[PDB]
Write a protein that binds this ligand. Structure first.
Ligand SMILES: CCCCNC(=O)[C@H](C)C[C@H](O)[C@@H](N)C[C@@H](C)CNC(=O)c1ccccc1OCCCOC
Length: 329
């Protein structure tokens, strides 16, 4: 009854990831600890060269590890941003301190957009067994089957060390006072119910309730293409191919937005959601909010990612199905 923790790296506020070690001797890999999926996956040595992705990433080759026993099931993972596909294997992942014998997919068809823009290599999901493709007991549920942790919970800090995950606890030197929690909606997904999105100080989006996937594996707040299309229109931002945008001098006047989450209002001012890489006019800055249409059944939902976890430290509490936000630091 212990509390370990993963130091995480921050790349440009859009990508936070960490280290695990698959295999004996350890084969390291950078991975994203994702609360919105539930598989572990690392590119394979079998990943044919044609995947511009696979050739440019660190990749697993069982060949070198005493403990790799194996199974060969094809599994196919349909993340909301692409698909990846490979078979799955057995061996040990040690995730920051804890070693466990895990099933992970070794991927192979691994599509360029977007895996070619990713500094990480794999993904370690931390969602419920309800969406483990292949219905395979997920890494968090194994740290807890050989249960060593203090509380069977974990929390994410994403810095503005790039950030940290704490297994079994909450480093209470990275937040200001007491998480307020929110019990779940479904069980099976880290999704909470959001009742009302506001800008300025009037509810403009989401008045008869909407859903919210809290997703550590996402860079920005995302919303369905309609709703973001109106969110931006009240912010006055402008579209430009990959993202809404507004010219850097107007930055500190774009109004604040407040996600009504559970009991209090999570307010994000423009310094929080705008990449003020220059307060000047003439260049025009990016907004950290994006349209994404997550498909049924998890979605259609807003998904609050890194733009949000960065202002609120987030504790995901398995034991009694609550997520709990507490102000940053
Ligand atoms: C079919 C199994 C998955 C079903 N669930 C889902 O698809 C979720 C709703 C979404 C999923 O959790 C995503 N969060 C997955 C995550 C790996 C998304 N990452 C990427 O798409 C990605 C790719 C390239 C570059 C960046 C990306 O995001 C990484 C952001 C990490 O910084 C925290």
């Amino acid at each position: 009854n212990t509390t370990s923790s993963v130091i995480l790296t921050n790349y440009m506020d859009t990508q936070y990831y960490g280290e695990i070690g698959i295999g004996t001797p350890p084969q390291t890999f950078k991975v994203v600890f994702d609360t919105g999926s539930s598989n572990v996956w690392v590119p394979s040595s079998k990943c044919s060269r044609l995947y511009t992705a696979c050739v440019y990433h660190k990749l697993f080759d069982a060949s070198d590890s005493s403990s790799y026993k194996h199974n060969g099931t094809e599994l196919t993972l349909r993340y909301s941003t692409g698909t990846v596909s490979g078979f799955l294997s057995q061996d040990i992942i040690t995730v920051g301190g804890i070693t466990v014998t895990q099933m992970f997919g070794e991927v192979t068809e691994m599509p360029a957009l977007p895996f070619m823009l990713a500094e990480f290599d794999g993904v370690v999901g931390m969602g419920f067994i309800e969406q483990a493709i292949g219905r395979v007991t997920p890494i968090f549920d194994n740290i807890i089957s050989q249960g060593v942790l203090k509380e069977d919970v974990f929390s994410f800090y994403y810095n503005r060390l790039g950030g940290q995950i704490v297994l079994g606890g909450s480093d209470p030197q990275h937040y200001e006072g007491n998480f307020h929690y929110i019990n779940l909606i479904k069980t099976g997904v880290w999704q909470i119910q959001m009742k009302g999105v506001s800008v300025g100080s009037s509810t403009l989006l989401c008045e008869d309730g909407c859903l919210a996937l809290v997703d550590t594996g996402a860079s920005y707040i995302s919303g369905s293409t309609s709703s973001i299309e109106k969110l931006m229109e009240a912010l006055g931002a402008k579209k430009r191919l990959f993202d809404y945008v507004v010219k850097c001098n107007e930055g500190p006047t774009l109004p604040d937005i407040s996600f009504h989450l559970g009991g209090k209002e999570y307010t994000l001012t423009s310094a929080d959601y705008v990449f003020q890489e220059s307060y000047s006019s003439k260049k025009l800055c990016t907004l950290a909010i994006h349209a994404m249409d997550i498909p049924p059944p998890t979605g259609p939902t807003w998904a609050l990612g890194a733009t949000f976890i960065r202002k609120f430290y987030t504790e995901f509490d398995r034991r009694n199905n609550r997520i709990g936000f507490a102000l940053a630091r």
